[PDB]
Design a protein around this ligand. Structure first.
Ligand SMILES: N[C@@H](CCC(=O)N[C@@H](CS[C@H](CC(=O)O)C(=O)O)C(=O)NCC(=O)O)C(=O)O
Ligand SMILES: N[C@@H](CCC(=O)N[C@@H](CS[C@H](CC(=O)O)C(=O)O)C(=O)NCC(=O)O)C(=O)O
Ligand code: NA
Ligand code: NA
Lengths: 214, 214
């Protein structure tokens, strides 16, 4: 028995979890679920995950869903390197940074939402881009402001080691680029993204590096 | 110094955090931020929370944001009663249930999103209700299915005691009622909501019980 990651190359939440798995050095089988072909909406995937979203992680004993919960599980199950700080204040700050992305940006721009905008509200692609940029810019305004007020911060979102906040931020910056969001206002975010981009664990997790990529 | 909770009566994330505070028996000063009057969008609130959303919790030493992160902080800071189980599997499951609501339902139906639908896409109130019901029903389909397959469950989302999953679920059911979502398909969810509704900590946290309520 071994871990199986049901996921997709060009998927922010998949990318997020791949970064965390790679940072922990945890081996996994990559099982592509082709979202463009709507494979996640088939009964076969529903049997694994009733929510019919990616990623899902089969540990060999059970199927875990929800990247935020899976990542917290990885942190506890595979201690080294730590992706959360040891102190209560730092724990809260890193979780808050992650949740800005995980709650207040990513879900709003997810495929199913954009499909609803297109099919119910008749959104064209300019309108889709304007929607996505609205939520990314609002979230990045806050994330950037938080990066600025932290005096102890190094190269990454928190301190001078990668944390789970970076696992959320990096895929979100990639989505921002996809939707042609002006990132000029976010130099601290851009610097964190660049620093993470130097690391093997992040490079190996990037959409373009995946088996199912174009 | 003491706890100051910046929040609003008719607010799902405020309600969510109020439940957790009440379960912990942690005293706090209720500081109303009137969302209808757009008080959260004023510079005074921006100075407290750069994201300009509620809730924010001033501990007396610093201002915490992001209800998921604040609730995790409360669990660690105020151990009794435990709102998370002790075992890795249970921890992950409770976090996953919470994240279905906190990531994949609540943010999609938030005020700012509905405002954008109205002002950019010309949505009338029937269209707003149809949008909200789409995401609530999808999330509740998954949540209901997950409740059904847990054989160790008592009256609540997980186990025999309230957990942070219930803190997220109860406000989400209230929002469902607000948007006239058919809850007939979700008898397990309705039973959890009813069970939580018997408890003082939940009753005291409900929108209609707040100082700034109608
Ligand atoms: N809170 C959950 C959210 C998972 C879910 O949003 N996953 C996306 C992940 S793929 C999505 C693809 C896209 O938006 O183009 C992305 O994040 O990039 C989903 O499978 N989309 C399919 C759909 O909306 O039909 C989690 O973090 O695991
Ligand atoms: N992930 C964050 C999300 C916080 C945020 O979404 N809060 C809402 C809380 S109030 C909201 C009010 C509503 O939707 O009518 C609700 O949840 O009920 C916000 O202040 N809305 C103001 C706005 O959109 O302009 C958190 O959980 O703290
Ligand atoms: Na890149
Ligand atoms: Na009620």
């Amino acid at each position: 028995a071994k871990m199986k990651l049901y996921n997709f190359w060009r998927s922010g939440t998949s990318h997020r979890l791949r970064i965390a798995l790679n940072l922990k050095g945890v081996p996994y089988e990559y099982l592509a679920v082709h979202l463009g072909k709507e494979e996640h909406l088939k009964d076969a995937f529903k049997a694994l995950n009733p929510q019919q979203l990616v990623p899902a992680l089969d540990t060999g004993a059970q199927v875990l869903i929800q990247s935020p919960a899976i990542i917290e599980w990885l942190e506890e199950q595979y201690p080294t390197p730590a992706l959360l700080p040891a102190d209560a204040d730092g724990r809260q700050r890193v979780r808050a940074l992650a949740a800005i992305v995980g709650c207040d940006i990513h879900p709003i721009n997810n495929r199913r939402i954009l499909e609803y905008l297109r099919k119910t509200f008749g959104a064209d692609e300019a309108a889709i881009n304007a929607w996505c940029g609205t939520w990314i810019s609002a979230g990045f305004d806050a994330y950037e402001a938080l990066l600025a007020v932290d005096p102890k911060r190094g190269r990454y979102s928190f301190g001078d080691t990668p944390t789970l906040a970076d696992c959320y931020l990096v895929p979100q910056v990639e989505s921002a680029r996809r939707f042609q969001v002006d990132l000029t206002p976010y130099p601290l975010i851009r610097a964190v993204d660049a620093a993470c981009g130097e690391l093997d664990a992040f490079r190996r997790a990037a959409p373009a590096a995946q088996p199912d990529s174009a």
